[PDB]
Symmetry: C3
Subunit: 289 residues, 3 copies
């Protein structure tokens, strides 16, 4: 069986003083299509493969291609994936919950380098022999993630730096905890990164959270992001403040709102301020199909 | 929801004295697949996105890729589209009705340069930051089209030439009228083009029409195309004559026929003669799926 | 109507002493998706077109694109195809039946050069104007195949070498016979190749066969492959020995097994030895969807 799903999004993206001769505001858009092939068996083992075709405004050649494949096998809550896998640091819960706006961005997200599912081809040839193995296990409330990525599997191992990551999250109705650790993240020796986050659903409508990161070899240093959101019916308000160790850096912050127009149609906007005082704003829609 | 539709066509394409060392007759074919994602809402607003994958004989690398995305929002007969949009000059009725043969060609089509939906990627990088906005409105019988195309939206506007076009067509059971105007067509300063056409369904089986064009900065100058067609059951006969202002140019003309083999299967052929006395002929099939 | 089908496969691929600085064992995988558009008519003539998107580990740019189109028309058991066609030498029965392992490989396959359906684009530009015509006819038990491939249809014919091939196979419940002949195979002048094969289903569970090849201008010279397989329920055991004329060459051989895990899920493995004493082994799964 083969199924297609995806989303489209478009709106205005503003970055103050974007560049000399450049327009500060542009119409940023993305079309994403996922192609998923699945083979179910009566033994209870499911096999699957997926390909992604994603286009973003500004893409080279004004064209769209597929990325590298991901394959998996699931059985009893355990899933083993091979190829262009999802990594533990990128998969844990809470880590991206400060994001806002129609482009789901946040200066409060981790400021480190690490491997993650690649949505597109890479013209540089860097990903040509990139191959990962991932294992996930959902043990009611608790989720375990494990990933190993070999940036070039054809070359003798001792010559390449592989990334290994572990992550776990747990949640009940009002408290959520998450942690992750990755060594040689992004295939960079000694770029060991860590994450610890907690959230409290202090209501049926609101949640506040705190994420802490060890950004490894990043110039940002350690980071702390405090975020929260509150739902007033169909509209959700979001905000966050983030601080990094980098000497002289500013406190990043953002405020935004989401509006659930209909099932699968979300209108969002935000105004944010970065660590180097960058001012960014956006307003657009995302529709799922 | 995601739906796929498209067509395939193949046949013989002949151009007399095509070139030294070249074959005059080749097997020309095209495969077109449209991928459309739609999100309907109970509020009556529909959202959609589309991608096209088209291959034509002779395409570089013997491969097929997708083009740049188009997004739209429809509500009450009004549709607003963004990205790789359909333009007013290319969308009005009547303007392409002289076309014949399985490749739907005609020297009687406008001999000017203007932007239109891009079916494929562009290796030159010219379309990388190309973005348009289009608005259409169907007011029973009357159709309004509006388009604005910015060839490079990231660059300061005063530095780039944007194309703006307006078009309208109206029709009852036997008369049709259409007009269009585009300034800086194709992003070429002062390349202002215009179209005025009328058709008369002098029967249930036949129609004759007259299209007039102001080809802007084209060497063709003004143009007049007289065309007509008549249906004898499943077979339709077509013909046209076209004249351009260019000094020394010949009168272009063509004769062809269509045969509706079955629903979605059309066999067509034509023999045409161009403004520079080019002789072209074709015979093939188009099947829709 | 448009339908998608395909398969995914992954496993371990081992080649002893693969290269200096290289890993002998890698995780080799492939994702194949076929897009087929069909137009059925009440006259009993079916039209179709197909595109393939295939990705294999190691592919350049870590991306996936479509290949060149194939079109066809079927009526009363006769099918005429145009474009990226399947060729007679590659389509006859028996010729690939010695293949084993999850990657369906065999040193016993013909060691010659010939054209065949192209699953992917070609960055070299060699396939840009490649066009073939194929005709097949199924006359109960007997299958006829005919193919003509013009490597560059735009260039004067006398300047290019076209490939022409004929093939036929016949089978009843226990005996199968197949033969094929192709002149200027692969567009190489005088590279005339031939195949003759026979198989005997000496049981409901086992079959033994013998394939003989004239490899044309290949250094292999004539070749003989003796193969057989036997099914013990869900597991099938396979083996083959192959000999080529090339002076000093070793006898190639392989042993492998298939395990039908469920409908559409096959686990396979093999250990093989080549003509130059290459030792290869593999173990993986193929799942169809
Ligand atoms: C300097 C900006 C130049 C481009 C024109 C700006 C006005 C564009 O909006 C109109 C068309 O729709 C496309 C953009 O999406 C904007 C609105 O937000 C999405 C729906 O709320
Ligand atoms: C195999 C799937 C098709 C993907 C291949 C596209 C390869 C294009 O690059 C070829 C070399 O030229 C370099 C292009 O510049 C960078 C393009 O990518 C960047 C923006 O998305
Ligand atoms: C010329 C700039 C155009 C692009 C950016 C527009 C940016 C402004 O929108 C910001 C929205 O976020 C504001 C806060 O939301 C709080 C709650 O009230 C809204 C309830 O739906
Ligand atoms: C100089 C031409 C060289 C190629 C061979 C010419 C004969 C080809 O037609 C046979 C195969 O079908 C493919 C082409 O479509 C032609 C017929 O028109 C379509 C159906 O009416
Ligand atoms: C990103 C989607 C894949 C589209 C990218 C293909 C890019 C190929 O070009 C890379 C640079 O090389 C130049 C090729 O020559 C022109 C090819 O296009 C012309 C015929 O259709
Ligand atoms: C060697 C050249 C091969 C490719 C071109 C073939 C061109 C000839 O076909 C032209 C058909 O148009 C003729 C006029 O149609 C008029 C009506 O009668 C047909 C009714 O179905
Ligand atoms: C030197 C090899 C380096 C990579 C790790 C080897 C172990 C890999 O197998 C585990 C993950 O699944 C992916 C590979 O498929 C192998 C098993 O065969 C398929 C199912 O029987
Ligand atoms: C038009 C469909 C997209 C296919 C075009 C990809 C063209 C990429 O090549 C552009 C020129 O650069 C040469 C690349 O090196 C070889 C890539 O292919 C080999 C491995 O599969
Ligand atoms: C380190 C090498 C890893 C990759 C290669 C593994 C190769 C070994 O597997 C070979 C299997 O073929 C053996 C013969 O099968 C005979 C029948 O018994 C099996 C019944 O299901």
């Amino acid at each position: 069986e083969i199924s297609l799903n995806g989303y489209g999004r478009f709106g205005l993206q503003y970055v103050e003083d974007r560049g000399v001769g450049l327009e500060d505001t542009i119409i940023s858009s993305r079309l994403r299509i996922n192609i998923v092939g699945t083979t179910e068996t009566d033994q209870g083992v499911t096999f699957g493969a997926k390909l992604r075709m994603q286009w973003d405004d500004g893409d080279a050649f004004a064209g769209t291609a597929g990325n590298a494949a991901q394959f998996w096998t699931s059985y009893n809550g355990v899933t083993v994936s091979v190829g262009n896998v999802d990594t533990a640091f990128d998969s844990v819960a809470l880590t991206y919950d400060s994001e806002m706006g129609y482009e789901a961005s946040s200066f409060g997200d981790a400021q480190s380098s690490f491997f993650a599912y690649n949505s597109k081809y890479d013209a540089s040839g860097a990903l040509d022999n990139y191959n990962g193995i991932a294992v996930t296990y959902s043990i009611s409330g608790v989720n375990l993630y494990l990933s190993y990525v070999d940036p070039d599997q054809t070359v003798d191992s001792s010559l390449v730096t592989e990334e290994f990551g572990i992550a776990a999250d747990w949640s009940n109705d009002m408290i959520s905890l998450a942690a992750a650790y990755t060594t040689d993240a992004g295939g960079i020796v000694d770029n060991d990164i860590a994450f610890v986050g907690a959230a409290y659903k202090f209501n049926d409508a609101g949640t506040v959270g705190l994420n802490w990161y060890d950004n490894g070899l990043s110039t940002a240093g350690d980071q702390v992001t405090l975020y929260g959101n509150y739902a007033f019916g169909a509209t959700t308000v979001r905000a966050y403040v983030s601080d990094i160790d980098r000497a002289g850096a500013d406190t990043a912050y953002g405020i935004g709102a989401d509006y659930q127009f209909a099932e699968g149609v979300k209108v969002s906007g935000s105004v944010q301020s970065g660590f180097a005082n960058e001012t960014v704003a956006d307003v657009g829609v995302r529709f799922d199909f």
